[PDB]
């Protein structure tokens, strides 16, 4: 990007930050573990029993 | 009333739809399972838009 | 000769300081009363009356 | 061992499945038949995208 910016020749460049976008840890916060508001749902057919 | 752990109001979500011009389809699978009654007055689409 | 009953979003009530009410997985939200949404925040659509 | 025809590996693909701009629903019926035995450490959900 930057790192100092006096006249149009004069200024220097600097390497813009490292920035590692991945998956967290054995995917956590990919799927709602204990939000309550949105569960998921094991049962049988004739599924009145999650 | 029963004690057991059990959904009071349920949302379904349509299966296979279908848009065209003139009609817009929709296919619900409401699954009734054991143990459980519904009437159908409390039945209604909730219709989201623009 | 109330006027500020427009002005609640949530009421948790939690009983032994572990047991939710309803409980059981009763609400679409379950664990607390949800009583007001902003609408940018409502993707899923579960607001009444318009 | 049985010598019978039976499979190993059973991909099952969802029976109906919601996307809007907070989360995505799928949902799956997993017919364990008679005669067959199913672990579900064994289970993980196999996910494309992009």
Same mark, same amino acid.
């Given at each position: 990007?930057?790192?100092?910016?006096?006249?149009?020749?004069?200024?220097?460049? +600097?390497?813009? /930050? @490292?920035?590692?976008?991945?998956? /967290?840890?054995?995917?956590?916060?990919?799927?709602?573990?204990?939000?309550?508001?949105?569960?998921?749902?094991?049962?049988?057919?004739?599924?009145?029993?999650? | 009333?029963?004690? /057991?752990?059990?959904?009071?109001?349920?949302?379904?979500?349509?299966?296979?739809?279908?848009?065209?011009?003139?009609?817009?389809? +929709?296919?619900?699978?409401?699954?009734?399972?054991?143990?459980?009654?519904?009437?159908?007055?409390?039945?209604?689409?909730?219709?989201?838009?623009? | 000769?109330?006027?500020?009953?427009?002005?609640?979003?949530?009421?948790?009530?939690?009983?032994?300081?572990?047991?939710?009410?309803?409980?059981?997985? /009763?609400?679409?939200? @379950?664990?607390?009363?949800?009583?007001?949404?902003?609408?940018?925040?409502?993707?899923?659509?579960?607001?009444?009356?318009?």
């Amino acid at each position: 990007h930057f790192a100092d910016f006096v006249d149009d020749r004069r200024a220097t460049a +600097a390497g813009n /930050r @490292p920035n590692y976008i991945g998956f /967290r840890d054995n995917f956590i916060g990919m799927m709602y573990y204990n939000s309550g508001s949105n569960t998921g749902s094991f049962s049988s057919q004739t599924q009145q029993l999650n | 009333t029963t004690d /057991r752990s059990q959904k009071l109001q349920l949302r379904v979500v349509p299966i296979q739809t279908e848009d065209n011009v003139n009609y817009y389809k +929709a296919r619900f699978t409401l699954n009734v399972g054991d143990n459980r009654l519904v009437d159908l007055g409390s039945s209604y689409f909730d219709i989201k838009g623009t | 000769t109330f006027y500020l009953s427009h002005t609640f979003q949530r009421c948790s009530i939690q009983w032994d300081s572990s047991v939710p009410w309803p409980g059981n997985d /009763r609400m679409l939200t @379950p664990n607390w009363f949800e009583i007001k949404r902003p609408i940018n925040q409502d993707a899923e659509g579960n607001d009444t009356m318009q």
